[PDB]
Amino acid sequence: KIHRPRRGSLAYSPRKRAKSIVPRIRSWPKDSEVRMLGFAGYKAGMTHILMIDDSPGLTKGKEIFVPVTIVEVPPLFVYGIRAYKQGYLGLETATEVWFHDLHKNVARRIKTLPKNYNEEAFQAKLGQLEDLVNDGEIADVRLLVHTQPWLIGLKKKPEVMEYAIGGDDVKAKFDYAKEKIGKELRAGEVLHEGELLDVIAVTKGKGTQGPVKRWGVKVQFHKAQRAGKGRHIGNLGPWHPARVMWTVPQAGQMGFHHRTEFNKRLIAIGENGKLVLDGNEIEITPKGGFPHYGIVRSDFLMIEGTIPGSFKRIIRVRPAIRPPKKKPPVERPQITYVSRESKQ
Amino acid sequence: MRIINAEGLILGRLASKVAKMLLEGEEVVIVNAEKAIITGNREDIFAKYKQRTELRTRTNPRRGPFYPKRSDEIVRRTVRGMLPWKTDRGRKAFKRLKVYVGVPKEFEGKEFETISEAHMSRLATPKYVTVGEVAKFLGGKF
Amino acid sequence: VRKAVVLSYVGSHEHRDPNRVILKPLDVNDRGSAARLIGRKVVWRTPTGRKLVGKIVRTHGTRGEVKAVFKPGLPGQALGDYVEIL
RNA sequence: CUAGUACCGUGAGGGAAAGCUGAAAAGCACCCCGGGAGGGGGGUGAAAAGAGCCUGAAACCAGGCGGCGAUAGGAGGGUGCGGCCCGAAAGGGUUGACCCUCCCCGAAGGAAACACGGGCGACCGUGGAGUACGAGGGGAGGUGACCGGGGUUGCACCGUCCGU
RNA sequence: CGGAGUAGGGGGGCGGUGUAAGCCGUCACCCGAGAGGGGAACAACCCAGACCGGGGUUAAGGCCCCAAAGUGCCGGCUAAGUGUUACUCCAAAGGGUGUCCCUGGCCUUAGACAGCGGCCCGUCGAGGUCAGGGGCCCCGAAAAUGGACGGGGCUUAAGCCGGCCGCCGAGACCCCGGCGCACGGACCGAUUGGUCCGUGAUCGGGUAGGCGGGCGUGCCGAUGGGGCGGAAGCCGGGCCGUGAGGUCCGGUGGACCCGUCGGUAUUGCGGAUCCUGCC
RNA sequence: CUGGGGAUAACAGAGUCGUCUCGGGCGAGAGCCCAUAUCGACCCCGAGGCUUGCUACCUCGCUGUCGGCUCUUCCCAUCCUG
RNA sequence: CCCGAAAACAGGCGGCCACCGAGGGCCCGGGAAGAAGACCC
Known part of the structure; x- marks a missing residue:
């Protein structure tokens, strides 16, 4: 008898087409700071930087190559409670x-x-909701938000979502929400440079595939390849x-x-397409533009590593529901080089 | 409808009486399901119910026995076992039943019936466990 | 209105008689003296108002049930329903 | 019946299928459509019986009519009933269908309430009582129109095909 | 005197053999060739042998729900879900201050532990200590898809022991009415018989097989009839008949057809990996 | 070659468990003395159905095959990991 | 973490329309999606 592990995981079944292109968040983290627990943007492209290592472990204090993804994040609009x-x-x-x-x-x-x-x-309805919340029946308060895809000329049909608020007092949450409703909200007011994040999106499509590629099955012996059963x-x-x-x-x-991905580090938050390294203001958009995505012009997140999705896909972000015990500091690291050469 | 409080009642005897009521044609509601008791040894009882919950069809789990982890569903399932379930008559009789954990505000403000044949007092041996404790062991919400 | 509930057909676990029926009177006094109904007529109504007529024959058990004959027999749609004694 | 024919095999040889308009061709004049097979109107005839021709069954196909029909389990049926539909004649029935009320007899069988006693008790004995009731058998008075039968389906229970 | 079929048997009890399963015989109750009521379903374990329509009482067994009938009574045991199994179809040798009982000895008003004090007393000062045997339970006790007291479930039980009281439950038993059969008898027929009466607790299942009576199909000799005012055939319906079948109504159809007696026969299909044609 | 046969073998399955795999009871002893740290004779009691046999209930054109590659799952009488 | 209102107690909330017409589909230019259908701009 020969032993070996089975081919593929059963934890992601059934492997079917996603219910919606807009991804849903199922669980939320426990945060003491009263803030909106996430943001949403659109994926633009990838580049690399050279930074001085911060995190615990070997390589600490040295200059290392780091791959980077860019996510364009125009301000959201809060339209409901x-x-x-x-x-x-x-x-x-x-x-x-x-x-x-x-x-x-x-x-x-x-429609x-x-x-x-x-x-x-609107104000009378706010008052009714306030008095309802002021009793003790209510258990949670959430914000209703929509994207503004028209600022960056990508499309005109917005994406509409619901976001939770941190803390443990409904009244504090309601005061926050009442001071937010009816306005535009930016990513710098919500996220802090150096955090760990979880990213959520729908992956790239590949259609119908066979088991060799869908599950990691082996290709049979060459006699079977000539018999008609290789794959x-x-x-x-x-x-x-x-x-x-x-x-x-x-x-x-x-x-x-x-x-869903775990523990991707936020490196820097940019404004109006620029990043400030050493007093300079440099453009992240490479010479010629991002492939299959044009120029970044509003605001952007720099995330370490890779993230699910095609280029113009909608991405959702939340803070670190499951972080390690030896987190790196919450502070933008020292960056020595950012690549903005042609990418095609 | 006949509203019955389950606090301090033996499960199978309660279920027998309720099944006969249903077949005769009454509508029944049961409150405080988590407070009925099961007699015997903790380990034997827990083992039996865990074994029940770990039963499943080997080719498709979307099919397969679905034995409960919640107290109200456990009570309901005992009653269903006491009926002819593969017939229209029993299907209707079972549809005529509802079970609740606690007493919801809806029923708040009424007097609850009991059952004499089923009550913790006819017992003499102290070995007994609670359905809520069974549910906690199995990992169900209330 | 001096009514009773139809409980079951007569027979054993494995077979049944479809012209005989077991009835439970609801009044406690009739249940205490169920034999003082032997010989009485008993009627069931159909969804169209028609009438099926039967007769109480003898006692059944000791809890207060009675046996009744209904030729022409009752349908299965009448097994947890009400019946009127005359 | 254009049969030892058509057709098979190098050959010796092997070898089918296929009957019927109408008394009389009176075998469809003339019109509209269609490229045309043809279709629709009109005509002949006692009857289309229309040459794809006497009668014209079943399997099978389509449409219409009736019943059921997307929470549900058995070889496709059996017993007992219920619901929708058909019901001129051949079956009954206004010389009275169905239903209602009262009266007499009555096989085997056969209670109970209640009163007095035995038993720790579940219960039992005596009287009520061979009464009430009882398959069937008969008779009297009322309302006046369906019943039996057939198709399909609902409920309850039963039922693991035929030949060897 | 005549006509057969049977020459592979099986379950259950007994005997020889064999590790056993099985092999070989024996008995002659059952299945084969036997319905129905129960054991969860079971060829042969229990009740019980069957013409048809009805009314009642019991048998096997059962009475918490599935499921008709008791959450029945008295006394006791078990704490392991042990068990909830008549059989078909259920694990032992060896052990257990686990609990409930019976018996037989030995110490006791200062005994059998511990303790103040080196066989002794002042105190804890009231019953104790050894042997056998019985009932229930426990250890001994590991298997492969997810799961089996029939299931739900049940703990002064819905389990076990010793007894008891009521009820439910078959085609068995009693009763009413109908069919047939066997035997006997009376009367009566132009051929194998017919009408009626009496007896049947002691007649009413049935394979191989034997016997009796009927239904239907095509031709002949006779007899009596029908048919263009519509024969045969076909379609759908009503009535009679245990039935094989018969006859009537309506429609289609357009030239032959039937009853009775007596004779004749290529005389009755669901099967043959049947034959032909059609779908 | 023809006709047949599960009335009768090979073959998987059912039954059985002599044999096989895994155990237990008691205590002669071995272990410097010390049965029982470890080992444990002779004799007695078992489980499993994964080895082979025995039998002939099922199938005589069901599939009549061993080994390997590929793919999934279960048992514990546990080799490593707790 | 993945699937999940067919969860037969077959759910909750806000809003629009009805009690001509809200809304939806075919059609047109195209992919980041794709065996037909479906999905997105």
Whole structure:
């Protein structure tokens, strides 16, 4: 008998097409600072830098090559506040409050907007929600946010999302939300340079693939390659049980999956397309523009490593639900070189 | 509907009476499911229920026995076991039942029936466990 | 209205008689004296108002049930339903 | 019946299928459509029986009508009922279908309330009582129109095909 | 005197053999050739042998729900879900201050531990200590897809022991009414018989097989009839008949057809990896 | 070659467990003395069904094959890891 | 961490329309998506 591990993981099944291109966040981290727990942007491209190492471990204090991804982040708009209560099993929405003046383009996602809904009505609804929250029934408060893709001329149909707030007092959360609603919100007010983040997006699509590539199955002997079975698995199982088991590798959809990554470091936050290294203001956009993505012009995040998704895809970010015990400092590192040469 | 408080009741006897009620044609609601008791030894009881929860079809788990981890579902499942479940008659009788953990505000403000044949007092041996404790061991929400 | 509940068909676990029926009177006094109904007529109504007529024959058990004959028999749609004694 | 024919095999040889308009061709004049097979109107005839021709069954196909029909388990049926639909004649029935009320007899069988006693008790004995009831058998008075039968389906219970 | 079929048997009990399963015989209750009511389902374990329609009482067994009938009564045991198994179809040698009982000896008003004090007393000062045997339980006790007291579940039980009281439950038993059969009898027929009466607790399952009576199909000799005012055939329906079948109604169809007696026969299909044609 | 046969072998399965794999009881002793750290005779009691046999209940055109490659899953009487 | 309102208690919230017409699809120019369908601009 020969032993070896099975081919592929069963933890990401069923391997099907994602429900939506806009990714959903299932869990939130416990933070003591009262702030919005995430942001959203669009992926632009990749480059590399040379920085002085900070994190614990060998290589500390030396100049190292580091791959980098760039995410364009125009400001979000806060258009609503939601209240949650506790039902029999879990949380259930108690009520919603919206802002009265919304951009003309929001109707491309939300086809049915209210007709008149003036400011005094909005304020009365805010007051009702305030008094409701001021009793003790309510358990959680969340913000309702929409992207503004028209500033960077990428498209006009926004993405609409819900974001949680940190802390442990509903009243503090509500004060924050009431001071935020109806306005534009920037990434520098939410994120801190040097943090660890979790990124969420839908992966690149690859269509239907066979088991060699979908599961890491082996290619058969060359006699079978000449017989007509090279890229096939041997058998679907034994005589008894007299059925095919769900654990047997098979062909199907590959790519376009919901996936989450852990502990990617935020290096720097840029403004208006520039980064400030040593007093200078340099452009991240390489000579000729990013391939399949043009010029960065509003604001951008520099994230260490790689992240799921194609280029113009929507990315969501949250802070470190599962960080290690020896975190690196929350401070922008010392950067000696940023590459902005042609990338095609 | 007949509302029954399960605090301090033996599970199988409660279930027998409730099943006969349902078949005769009444609508039944049961509150305080987590407070019914099961007699015997902790380890034997826990082992039995864990074994139940770890039963599954080997070719497809989307099929397969779905034995409960929650107290209200455990009570419901005991009752269902006491009925003819593969017939329209029993399906209707079982549809006529509802079980609740605690007393929800809806039912707050009423007087609850009991069952004499089922009560912790007919017992003499102190070995007994609670359905809520079973559920906690199995890892279910309440 | 002097009514009773239809419980089951007569027979054993494995076979049944479809012209005989077991009835439970609801009044405690009729249940205490169920034999004082032997010989009485008993009616069931259909979804269209038609009437099926039967007769109480003898006692069944000791808890207060009675046996009744219904030729022409009852349908299975009448097994947890109400019936009126005359 | 244009049969030892068509057709098979180098040859010796092997070897099918295929009957019927109408009394009389009276075998469809004339019109519209269509490239045309042809279709639709009109005509002949006692009857289209229309040469794809006497009668014209079943399997099979399509449409219409009736019943069921997307939470649900058995060889496709059996017993008992319920719901929708068909019901001129051949079956019953206004000389009275169905239903309602009361009266008499009554096989085997056969209670109970209640009163007095035995038993720790579940229960039992005596009287009520061979009464009430009881498959069937008969008779009297009322309302007046369906019942039996057939197709499909719902509920309850039963039922692991035929030949060897 | 005549006509057969049977020359592979099986379950259960007994005997020889064999590690055993099995092999060979024996008995002659069952299955084969035997319905129905139960054991979860079971060829042969239990009740019980079957014409048809009905009304009642019991048997095997059962009475917490599935599921008709008791969350039944008295006394006791088990704490291991042990168990909830008549059989078909259930693990031992060896052990256990685990608990409930029986018996037989030995010390006791200062005994059998510990303790103040080196066989002794002042105190803890009231019953104790050894042997056998019995009941229930425990250890001994490991298997492969996820799972089996039939299931749910059950702990002064819905388990076990010794007894008891009521109820439910078959085609068995009693009763009412109908069919047939066997035997006997009376009366009566132009051929194998018919109408009625009496007896049947002691007649009513059935393979191989034997016997009796009926239904239907094509031709002949006779007899009686029908048919263009619509024969045969075909389609859908009603009535009679245990039934094989018969007859009537309506529609289609357009030239032959039937009943009775007596004779004749290429005389009745679901199967043959049947034959032909069609789908 | 023809006709047949699961009335009858090889072959997997069912049954059985002599044999096989894994154990236990008691205590002669060996272990400087010390049965029991370790080992444990002779004799008695078992489990599993993974070895081979025995039998002939199933199949005579079901598939009649050993080994290897490939792919999935389960048991514990545990080699490493706790 | 992945799937998940067909979870038969077959859910909650906000908003729009009905009690001509909200909304949706075919169509057109195209991919970051793709065996047909589906998805996105």
